[PDB]
C-alpha cells in the first residue's frame, strides 16, 4: 500500500523524535537539579545550624559560673515548682515552629516538582493528535 | 435486551395510535351521513 | 493581575509563539492593553534627562547588560553599545545603581532649558432645553467652577440657534457689561473665516486678552454668564423643535484654539442636550416632522443615511482638525431623545475625552461624572495628562500593526511596523490629545520569524513603551515602561500556559467593534465564532469523533463564557437599542480597563442572601436566582440595579423591619445601599443607580440581561407521564423570561461538537 | 415537524416536556418579534384559524394581544362561527365608517394620591416615564401611555391602580380624587381623534367598613380573572388556584359579620353575595383548568377574555 | 508505506523496553534516602539548639501558659493540614510512568491496528 505516506509519516517521525525523547530528558533533568538544589540549600542550613551549636554550645559550659547555670539547669527533680513548666512549653513551641518552617519550604519546593507535568505532557497529547487524525483523513483518499 | 428494545417500540406504537379518537369520529361521520340523507329527504318535499 | 499591577500592561499571550506558522497555530492575535498613565506603586519621578540609545531610542532599562569595566551599556533591542556620559562614569559601581536599572516603570521629569500652560476648558453650553434641565446645568457648572484649579483657564460659549462666544474678564471701567461675539447658524464658516471675524487672527496675546483668562482673575465674570444663562427666545414654526447648531458651536470653539494655543493643553467640553437641527452636522430636520435615524434605518440603508454620511464628513473634518492641533473634546450628551452619538463619536475617539450619556440632568449619571472629571489625585493636582505621544520599540522578532483605542496614528514609517494593518497603523507613535487615569489602548503585534532558529539564546523578547505627556503642574513628562516575555522554548506548549482568558477576551471585543465600523455584523460574527471554534479545536483535550472526552484547562475554560456573552452583548448586536446607546457602548469600551470591561461583557450578579449570614458570592447569571427571599445586585458598568423579591418587598410594606426582632433584615437592606454607593464613587461614568423589585419598580433592566432559567427548550425534552393531578396545587410562583438567546449549556454543546469533529 | 408519526403538543405535553414539540421555542419567540415589529409600525394582526387539527394558536396568540388584534377560532371556514365573525369585522356604524380605531394612544393621568401599576389586555407600554407611575407593576407597566394599534367598540382594557398615601391625616374630609384617560386614534374617515374621559371618586373615612357600599362585585370578578390568567403565563395555574382561594378567604372574613367559630351566624352583604360564586366558576372554567382541552382552544379563551368587557366576561 | 510503519514500531518500542527510565530513577532514589537522612540532621541540630537557647534566655503563669500552648495546638493543625497536603502532591507526582507509558501504549496499539491493516 505505497499510497504517498512518505512525506507525511516522515513529519510524524520528526515529531516523535524531537519531542518524545527530548521531553523525557528535559524533565528528568528538571527534578534532579532542584533536588541538587535541595542538596545545596539543606547543607547551607547545616552550616549555620552546626555553628549555632558550637559557639553557643561551648560558651555556656566552658566558663565556671555559666557552666553552673547548666549544672543547676531546671533541676533533675520532681515538683516542677511553677517555673519549669512555665518554661518548656516554649521549648516544644520552638521545636514546633522550626519543623513548621522546614515543612513549609518542603511544600514550596515540592510545587516545582508537581507543576511540571501538566503542560508539557498535554503537549504530547497535542502535537501527536492532529498528526494521527490527519493520518486517517489523508488515508481515506486512495 | 430485546425486551427493553421493543417494550419501547410497543409503547411508541400506542401513543402514535389514536384508537379511541377514531371511533368518536366514525359516529360523527355516520350522523353526517344521516344528516345529509335527511337533507335530501327534505329536498324532495 | 500582577502584570497589570506592575506596568499596567496585559498581554493575551504571556508566552509568545515562535514563528509565523506558530502564530497561525495559536490562531489568536497577539496583543496587549497598556494603560499609559496608570498610577501604580512602582513609579519614581526623577529630575534628570533619560539616556537614549542613538540607534534605537531605548532608555536604560533593568534588562540591560552593563559592562562595568568599560562604563558601557548595551541596548537590548539594537544590540549596539553606548557609553555612560561623564557623570554616570563614576557612581556606576555594582552597589550604587540608579533607579533606571532597578525599577521597570520609571518616570522622568524632563528638565527644560517658564510656567508651562495650565489646562484650558471651554464650556460649550447648550440653551435649547427645558427650563428645569437648564437650571440644574447652571448648578453643576457652578460646582464645577469651584473645582477649577487656581491656575486653570476657562472660556464660556453658550450656543443654540446661533452661537454666542462670550468674552471674559473685561475692564474694571464698566463691571456692568458682558460682551458676546454672535455667529449666525446655518452658515458653515471655514476655519480662517472665524479667525478673521473674531479679530484674534506670556502665552496670552492681547487679541486673546478679551478671551481666555485665569479663573483666579475672572471669578465674577464666570458667575455672571452662568446666571444670565437662560433659554432661546425664538418662536419656532408650529411643531418645530428649538433650532440648534451644535456643529457650528464646535467649529467656533476649535477655531479659537487654532490661532490661539496650538500644541498646548486645552479641552472643549460640550454639554449638548438635543440633536443638531440646522447648519452642519445635520442628523434630522429643524421641524419635529420626519423621523430621526434608527438602528433599523442603518440596517435597510434608508434615505436618512444622507444625514448620516454628510454629517459624518463634517464631524470627522473637525476631528482631524482637533487632532492636528492637539486638543481633546468631551461630550456630555443628556438628551431625552436621539442626539447624534454615531457622528460625534469620531471626534472623541480620535482625541480622547468623555462620552458621558445622561438622560435629563437630574439623573445621577451626569452630576457626579462632571465632578469626577475635575477631581484631584493624592498629590492634589488634576489626574490627567495632555499631548501624550506613545511610541513603541519592538524587537527584531515582532512588529506592531495596530493601536485600537483612544489614539491616532501619525507616521514615522520604518522597520518597526509591518504590513497587514489591523486597526490604525502605518505608524510607530500615536498622538493623544489628552489621556486620563482610565484610558487603555489595544496594541497588536505579529511575529514574523520565517525560520525557527532566529531567536537569541533564551530570548526574553524585549519591548519598550514610551509616553510623553504633560502634567498640569506645568512640567513636561516622559514615562517609560519596559517589559519582557520569554517564549517558545523547544519543549512544546509554552505559549498556551501564558494565555489568560480575560485579556484575550477584551482584545477580540475591540477587534469586533472596529470591524463592525468597517463591515456588517453578519461576517464579523462568522469570523468571531470561527476564531472561537479554531481556538477550542486546537486548545483542548479530546479524542476525535468523541465529544464525551472533552476537557479544558483553567486558562482555557472560562473564555467560551466571555465569548457567549460577547455574542450576546450590545456591542455586536446593533438592534434592541438606539444608535446613540450602541455608540455610547462602543465609545467607552475602546477606553476601559480590563477588569471593568470584563464586567461590561459579562454582567456581575452579586447575590445577597438572607440565610447565608456573610459575604456575597458571585452566582451564575441565570434566572435561578429570582427567588423572592433574596436581593440581587447587577453590575454591567451602566446599571447598578438592585433587585428585590416579592417576599422582601411586602416585608417592607407591612413592616417586619421596623419592629426590632429583624435587625438581620435591616442589615440585609442596608448592604445593597452601602455597597452600591462604593461602586458608584470609584468608577467613571457613574452608572445609573436604579432601585428595583420583583415584577415592578424598574426591574425590566435586570430581567433583560438575566438568562432564562427554565428554558422552553428544556420544557420540550421527551417523557411526559403520571404527574397530572397531585400535590395541593401550588409551587413557589415561578417567573418566565423569553429571549432570542440559546442557553449557555447548549451553546457549549455546539462548541464541543463542532470542535471534536474538526 | 413533517413526519406524521409524531403528534402535535397538548397540555400534558407542555407541562411535562415532550419531544413532540421540539420547534415551539423559536416558533413562539419568532411571533413575538413580529409583534415587536408590529407595534413600532402600528399594524395589527388578526387571525382567522379554521381546522380540526391544531393551528398553533398558543404561539401565535402573541401578536393579537400585543397590537389589539382579534382571534376567531372555528372548526371550519364554512361554519357560522367564521362567516359571521368575518362579516362583522367589516360592519359599519351610523355613518358608514368602520367600527374600529387604529394607532390608538391610551394615556392615563392621576392625582398625586395614587399612581398606575400597569395594564392588562390589548395594549403595550411605551416607557413614557413620569410622576404618575407606581412602583408595583401589574402586567405592562413603566408608562402612562400605551400603544394599541387596534381597538373597537368591545375592546376593554384593565387598568390597575395603587394608593400611595401613608397617613389618613393628610386628607381633608370629603376629598375627591380624579383620574383621566385620553385616546388618540385614527378614525376610519382619516382624521385624528382624542377622547378625554374624566371620573371623580371620593376617599373613605379611616374606618375600614365604610368602603363596603362602594364595592362592585361584577367588575372585581373580571379584575381577578384577568389577573389570574396573566399570572398563569409565568407561574403555574395550580399556584394561581391557591392564590385565588386564599384571597377569597381573606376577603370574605374581612367583609362579613359573624361570631367567632360560629358558622350559623355567617352573613354576607348584597355587594358580596354573589362574589364567592364567581371564583367557584373561575376555578372550574377552562381559563385556569387545562383538562379536556387543547392548548389552542385554551389560547382562544384566554385571548378573547383579555379584550372583552364586563358583561362578556361574566358570560364566559 | 509498510517500511515506514515497521521502523515506527522499532523506533517506538525501543523507548518502551529501555531500562533507561529505571536508571535515572535509581539516581533520584539514592539522593532521596540521604536527603531524608539529612532531614533528620535538621531535626537533631535544631531540637538541641531550641533547647539550649531556652537555658540561657533570662503577666502571671495563668496567662502565659494560656497563650504559647494556644500557640501550640495550632502546630497541631498545621502539620496535620500540610502533611495531608504533602501526600497529595506525592500522589500527583505518583503518575510518572503510569500515564506517560499509557500514552506510549496508546500510540503502540493504534499504530498496530494500522500495521495489521497494511499487512492484510
Short mmCIF file of N, CA and C in Angstrom, two decimals, chain C residues 649 691 693 695-700 712-724 726-736 738-741, chain D residues 12-22 24-25 28-29 32-33 58 129 134-139 141-142 233-236 238-242 245:
data_model
loop_
_atom_site.label_atom_id
_atom_site.label_comp_id
_atom_site.label_asym_id
_atom_site.label_seq_id
_atom_site.Cartn_x
_atom_site.Cartn_y
_atom_site.Cartn_z
N UNK C 649 -40.17 42.60 49.42
CA UNK C 649 -40.88 43.85 49.19
C UNK C 649 -42.08 44.00 50.12
N UNK C 691 -33.28 51.62 41.79
CA UNK C 691 -33.89 50.65 42.69
C UNK C 691 -34.84 49.76 41.90
N UNK C 693 -37.52 45.95 42.19
CA UNK C 693 -38.14 44.87 42.94
C UNK C 693 -38.85 43.96 41.95
N UNK C 695 -41.23 42.02 39.64
CA UNK C 695 -42.44 42.43 38.96
C UNK C 695 -42.78 43.89 39.17
N UNK C 696 -41.79 44.77 39.12
CA UNK C 696 -42.07 46.17 39.38
C UNK C 696 -40.81 47.00 39.50
N UNK C 697 -41.00 48.16 40.11
CA UNK C 697 -40.03 49.24 40.28
C UNK C 697 -39.42 49.62 38.93
N UNK C 698 -38.19 49.21 38.63
CA UNK C 698 -37.67 49.23 37.26
C UNK C 698 -36.89 47.96 36.95
N UNK C 699 -37.46 46.80 37.27
CA UNK C 699 -36.79 45.52 37.10
C UNK C 699 -36.78 45.03 35.66
N UNK C 700 -37.30 45.81 34.71
CA UNK C 700 -37.22 45.41 33.30
C UNK C 700 -35.78 45.44 32.79
N UNK C 712 -37.65 27.11 27.60
CA UNK C 712 -38.75 26.38 26.98
C UNK C 712 -38.22 25.19 26.18
N UNK C 713 -36.94 25.25 25.77
CA UNK C 713 -36.28 24.12 25.13
C UNK C 713 -36.16 22.93 26.06
N UNK C 714 -35.84 23.17 27.33
CA UNK C 714 -35.84 22.10 28.32
C UNK C 714 -37.24 21.75 28.78
N UNK C 715 -38.24 22.52 28.35
CA UNK C 715 -39.65 22.22 28.56
C UNK C 715 -40.21 21.46 27.34
N UNK C 716 -39.34 20.94 26.48
CA UNK C 716 -39.78 20.05 25.40
C UNK C 716 -38.84 18.87 25.16
N UNK C 717 -38.39 18.19 26.21
CA UNK C 717 -37.32 17.21 26.06
C UNK C 717 -37.63 15.72 26.07
N UNK C 718 -38.89 15.33 25.89
CA UNK C 718 -39.28 13.93 25.95
C UNK C 718 -39.70 13.45 27.33
N UNK C 719 -40.68 12.55 27.40
CA UNK C 719 -41.03 11.90 28.65
C UNK C 719 -42.07 12.52 29.57
N UNK C 720 -43.31 12.68 29.11
CA UNK C 720 -44.42 13.17 29.93
C UNK C 720 -45.29 12.01 30.36
N UNK C 721 -45.46 11.85 31.67
CA UNK C 721 -46.34 10.83 32.23
C UNK C 721 -46.59 11.13 33.70
N UNK C 722 -47.75 10.67 34.18
CA UNK C 722 -48.03 10.33 35.59
C UNK C 722 -47.72 11.46 36.58
N UNK C 723 -47.98 12.71 36.18
CA UNK C 723 -47.90 13.81 37.14
C UNK C 723 -48.98 14.87 36.89
N UNK C 724 -50.15 14.46 36.42
CA UNK C 724 -51.18 15.40 36.03
C UNK C 724 -52.08 15.95 37.12
N UNK C 726 -51.81 16.22 41.29
CA UNK C 726 -51.11 15.93 42.54
C UNK C 726 -50.84 17.20 43.32
N UNK C 727 -50.69 17.05 44.64
CA UNK C 727 -49.92 17.95 45.48
C UNK C 727 -50.42 19.34 45.83
N UNK C 728 -51.71 19.47 46.15
CA UNK C 728 -52.30 20.62 46.84
C UNK C 728 -52.21 21.93 46.06
N UNK C 729 -51.85 21.88 44.78
CA UNK C 729 -51.98 22.98 43.81
C UNK C 729 -51.23 24.25 44.25
N UNK C 730 -49.90 24.14 44.27
CA UNK C 730 -49.09 25.34 44.40
C UNK C 730 -47.59 25.13 44.49
N UNK C 731 -46.80 25.88 43.71
CA UNK C 731 -45.34 25.80 43.83
C UNK C 731 -44.70 27.14 43.44
N UNK C 732 -44.52 28.00 44.44
CA UNK C 732 -43.43 29.00 44.51
C UNK C 732 -43.54 30.16 43.52
N UNK C 733 -44.59 30.17 42.69
CA UNK C 733 -44.82 31.24 41.72
C UNK C 733 -43.67 31.63 40.81
N UNK C 734 -43.31 30.76 39.87
CA UNK C 734 -42.11 30.96 39.06
C UNK C 734 -42.29 32.08 38.03
N UNK C 735 -41.17 32.68 37.63
CA UNK C 735 -41.16 33.75 36.65
C UNK C 735 -40.60 33.23 35.32
N UNK C 736 -41.21 33.66 34.22
CA UNK C 736 -40.86 33.18 32.89
C UNK C 736 -40.26 34.31 32.06
N UNK C 738 -38.58 35.26 28.21
CA UNK C 738 -38.40 34.90 26.81
C UNK C 738 -37.37 35.82 26.15
N UNK C 739 -36.40 35.21 25.47
CA UNK C 739 -35.37 35.95 24.75
C UNK C 739 -34.86 35.09 23.60
N UNK C 740 -34.19 35.74 22.65
CA UNK C 740 -33.69 35.09 21.44
C UNK C 740 -32.50 34.17 21.71
N UNK C 741 -32.00 34.14 22.94
CA UNK C 741 -30.70 33.59 23.26
C UNK C 741 -30.80 32.11 23.62
N UNK D 12 -50.80 18.23 28.55
CA UNK D 12 -49.92 17.29 29.23
C UNK D 12 -48.55 17.25 28.57
N UNK D 13 -48.47 17.62 27.29
CA UNK D 13 -47.18 17.65 26.62
C UNK D 13 -46.38 18.88 27.04
N UNK D 14 -47.08 19.99 27.31
CA UNK D 14 -46.42 21.22 27.71
C UNK D 14 -45.97 21.17 29.16
N UNK D 15 -46.77 20.54 30.03
CA UNK D 15 -46.48 20.55 31.46
C UNK D 15 -45.26 19.70 31.78
N UNK D 16 -45.08 18.59 31.06
CA UNK D 16 -44.03 17.63 31.38
C UNK D 16 -43.19 17.30 30.16
N UNK D 17 -42.74 18.33 29.44
CA UNK D 17 -41.67 18.33 28.43
C UNK D 17 -41.61 17.12 27.49
N UNK D 18 -42.53 16.99 26.54
CA UNK D 18 -42.32 16.03 25.46
C UNK D 18 -41.54 16.57 24.27
N UNK D 19 -40.92 15.63 23.56
CA UNK D 19 -40.18 15.81 22.33
C UNK D 19 -41.09 15.97 21.12
N UNK D 20 -42.41 15.91 21.30
CA UNK D 20 -43.33 16.15 20.19
C UNK D 20 -43.35 17.61 19.75
N UNK D 21 -42.74 18.51 20.51
CA UNK D 21 -42.80 19.94 20.25
C UNK D 21 -41.40 20.55 20.33
N UNK D 22 -40.44 19.97 19.60
CA UNK D 22 -39.06 20.47 19.64
C UNK D 22 -38.89 21.83 18.97
N UNK D 24 -41.37 24.54 19.07
CA UNK D 24 -42.26 25.59 19.56
C UNK D 24 -41.52 26.75 20.21
N UNK D 25 -40.20 26.64 20.39
CA UNK D 25 -39.47 27.70 21.09
C UNK D 25 -39.25 28.87 20.16
N UNK D 28 -42.54 30.42 18.95
CA UNK D 28 -43.28 31.41 19.73
C UNK D 28 -42.52 32.73 19.79
N UNK D 29 -41.20 32.67 19.98
CA UNK D 29 -40.43 33.90 20.05
C UNK D 29 -40.15 34.50 18.67
N UNK D 32 -43.17 36.69 18.58
CA UNK D 32 -43.06 37.83 19.48
C UNK D 32 -42.29 38.97 18.82
N UNK D 33 -41.35 38.66 17.93
CA UNK D 33 -40.59 39.76 17.34
C UNK D 33 -41.32 40.32 16.12
N UNK D 58 -51.45 28.76 20.41
CA UNK D 58 -50.75 29.09 21.65
C UNK D 58 -49.55 30.00 21.39
N UNK D 129 -41.92 57.78 30.92
CA UNK D 129 -41.76 57.97 32.35
C UNK D 129 -42.54 59.19 32.83
N UNK D 134 -46.46 53.96 39.39
CA UNK D 134 -46.30 53.33 40.69
C UNK D 134 -45.10 52.39 40.66
N UNK D 135 -44.62 52.04 41.86
CA UNK D 135 -43.60 51.00 41.97
C UNK D 135 -44.15 49.66 41.51
N UNK D 136 -45.28 49.23 42.04
CA UNK D 136 -45.85 47.94 41.68
C UNK D 136 -46.25 47.92 40.21
N UNK D 137 -46.02 46.78 39.55
CA UNK D 137 -46.40 46.56 38.17
C UNK D 137 -47.41 45.43 38.12
N UNK D 138 -48.53 45.67 37.43
CA UNK D 138 -49.46 44.62 37.06
C UNK D 138 -49.45 44.54 35.54
N UNK D 139 -48.61 43.66 35.00
CA UNK D 139 -48.62 43.44 33.56
C UNK D 139 -47.69 44.38 32.84
N UNK D 141 -46.36 47.71 32.58
CA UNK D 141 -46.21 48.93 33.36
C UNK D 141 -45.26 49.93 32.73
N UNK D 142 -44.60 50.71 33.60
CA UNK D 142 -43.49 51.59 33.24
C UNK D 142 -43.83 52.71 32.28
N UNK D 233 -49.40 32.81 32.88
CA UNK D 233 -48.42 32.84 31.80
C UNK D 233 -47.02 32.52 32.31
N UNK D 234 -46.66 33.05 33.48
CA UNK D 234 -45.34 32.82 34.07
C UNK D 234 -45.35 31.78 35.17
N UNK D 235 -46.34 31.81 36.05
CA UNK D 235 -46.44 30.86 37.15
C UNK D 235 -47.34 29.69 36.76
N UNK D 236 -47.36 28.68 37.63
CA UNK D 236 -48.23 27.53 37.42
C UNK D 236 -49.69 27.93 37.63
N UNK D 238 -51.81 25.93 38.86
CA UNK D 238 -52.14 25.38 40.17
C UNK D 238 -51.84 26.38 41.28
N UNK D 239 -50.69 27.07 41.20
CA UNK D 239 -50.34 28.06 42.21
C UNK D 239 -51.28 29.26 42.18
N UNK D 240 -51.78 29.60 40.99
CA UNK D 240 -52.77 30.66 40.86
C UNK D 240 -54.07 30.24 41.55
N UNK D 241 -54.40 28.94 41.48
CA UNK D 241 -55.60 28.43 42.14
C UNK D 241 -55.52 28.57 43.66
N UNK D 242 -54.34 28.32 44.23
CA UNK D 242 -54.16 28.53 45.67
C UNK D 242 -54.23 30.01 46.01
N UNK D 245 -57.84 31.17 46.04
CA UNK D 245 -58.51 30.55 47.18
C UNK D 245 -58.22 31.33 48.46
#
